[PDB]
């Protein structure tokens, strides 16, 4: 039986995970106490009689984001040893989450991952949720990902990470914390899906006509993208896409493995009645940069490998005609050496709507995860933000004093400088 393990690290990880597992329990009919009144084996672990346990852990050094899960409406759902807390947070410091307080808790992190991996029969990959801005998501995620490649070799590891926006960011050492994270998520994480908070602010602004979006609204459709990514395991359809199928189709080179994300239908409860939702409309909607979930413009770069995972009443012919209409457009430009850029997946389960949520019930939905050379704009800008702040040694004594040395800033900068060289070299036309 197929199974995927999701680790939730840092403040973004749990708050996505509360939205992620809320979407998961409504799909399988499982109530919040854990009782369903044959496909739950992907995410839920059956124990006893009529009890389902999520196959996930909440790892965060700050206890005040985990305790609200331990006292909320999901008390009876999670296993209490899966919820791993700590004495004090890493305080957006990469050195604390990696050296000082990170090593004191990562031993207990592997103790339950091994328990989750032993209960699994057939494992296909890992999900990791973190934010590189904060040192719990950045440093402890770097420590856990480095350890997992040593502990569980050659297995898939899905990186659902959140990056600082160009114009928007809510911390000061985020240029410092993102660059040091890119030394680990380059050489360990095999598939990394960038997310960006301001692009989802814009997505919630126009498509969902919400003037005042919050962190709950953003993470609810974060849950929609991941659930659409792994709906192929849980339900049957025309063209299934497995985790290792997902990894060999979109990673042409072992370092060129960062991919975009786009969920096409975001419609309100009042605009759903007036929109004629067909597979031609949603496929053109996904490639629009308005529906792009990261603040980058794909027109500058080249699309290199794309996958389109369809949910609902999608018949296999016009979706094959919808891809042809995308290829004819000069705006969506592909790289020269790849004449076959599209992967297609169709599942027959329409996306569930949470009660009290903001999304409307749609009969068709597509999620695009695409590898592009326009993601170099994400890294080069965060490279410029780091290079300006490092030039006068700002916020270094906090990082150096907690175990680090100055030499790890030069290695991480050189590693990220190779990525910008690699993106330009790969995307060059010959």
């Amino acid at each position: 039986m197929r199974e995927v393990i999701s680790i939730h690290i840092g403040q973004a990880g749990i708050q996505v995970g509360n939205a992620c597992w809320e979407l998961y329990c409504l799909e399988h009919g499982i109530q919040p106490d854990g009782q369903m009144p044959d496909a739950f084996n992907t995410f839920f672990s059956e124990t006893g009689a009529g009890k389902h346990v999520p196959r996930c852990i909440f790892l965060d050094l700050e206890p005040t984001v985990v305790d609200e899960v331990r006292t909320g409406t999901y008390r009876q759902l999670f296993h209490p040893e899966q919820l791993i807390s700590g004495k004090e947070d890493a305080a957006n410091n990469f050195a604390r989450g990696h050296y000082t307080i990170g090593k004191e808790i990562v031993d207990l992190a592997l103790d339950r991952i091994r328990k989750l991996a032993d209960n699994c029969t057939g494992l296909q990959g890992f999900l990791v949720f973190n934010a590189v801005g904060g040192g719990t998501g950045s440093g402890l995620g770097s420590l856990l990902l480095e350890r997992l490649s040593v502990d569980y070799g050659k297995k898939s590891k899905l990186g659902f990470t959140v990056y600082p926006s160009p114009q928007v960011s809510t911390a000061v050492v985020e240029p410092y914390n993102s660059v040091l994270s890119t030394h680990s998520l380059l050489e360990h994480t095999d598939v990394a899906v960038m997310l960006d908070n301001e692009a989802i602010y814009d997505i919630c602004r126009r498509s969902l006509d919400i003037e005042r979006p919050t962190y709950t609204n953003l993470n609810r459709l974060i849950a929609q993208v991941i659930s659409s990514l792994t709906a192929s395991l849980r339900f049957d359809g025309a063209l299934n896409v497995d985790i290792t199928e997902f990894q060999t189709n979109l990673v042409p080179y072992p370092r060129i493995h960062f991919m975009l994300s786009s969920y096409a239908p975001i419609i309100s409860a009042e605009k759903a009645y007036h929109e004629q939702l067909s597979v031609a409309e949603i496929t053109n909607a996904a490639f629009e940069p308005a529906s792009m979930m990261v603040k980058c413009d794909p027109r500058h770069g080249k699309y290199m490998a794309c996958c389109l995972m369809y949910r609902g009443d999608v018949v296999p012919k016009d979706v094959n005609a919808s891809v042809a209409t995308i290829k004819t457009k000069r705006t969506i430009q592909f790289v020269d050496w790849c004449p076959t850029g599209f992967k297609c997946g169709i599942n027959y389960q329409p996306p569930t709507v949470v009660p009290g949520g903001d999304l409307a019930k749609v009969q068709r939905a597509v999620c695009m995860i695409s590898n592009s050379t326009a993601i170099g704009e994400i890294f080069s800008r965060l490279d410029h933000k780091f290079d300006l702040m490092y030039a006068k040694r700002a916020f270094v004594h906090w990082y150096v004093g907690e175990g680090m040395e100055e030499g790890e800033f030069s290695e991480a900068r050189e590693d990220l400088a190779a990525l910008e060289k690699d993106f330009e070299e790969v995307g060059a036309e010959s």
Partner: protein, 78 residues
């Protein structure tokens, strides 16, 4: 006179299996759910199969008018 303790109570009964007295069903639970009504029955007459075309069945009188009015399987354009 040792105390009786409950058996694991498996459904095995390999004597019954090898004699074939009880058939049962050796298959496990079906995975990947079971989606209802997918692929959908088409509008402009309900077509879930190509048996009509591949068996050359005669058209019914209650359905002949649809193809009298329209050419393709898209419904009632005019």
């Amino acid at each position: 006179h040792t105390r009786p303790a409950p058996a694991p109570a498996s459904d095995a009964y390999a004597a019954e299996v090898i004699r074939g007295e009880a058939a049962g069903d050796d298959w496990g639970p079906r995975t990947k759910r079971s989606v209802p009504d997918m692929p959908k029955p088409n509008a402009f007459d309900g077509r879930t199969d190509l048996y009509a075309h591949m068996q050359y069945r005669p058209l019914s009188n209650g359905e002949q008018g649809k193809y009298a009015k329209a050419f393709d399987d898209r419904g009632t354009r005019g």
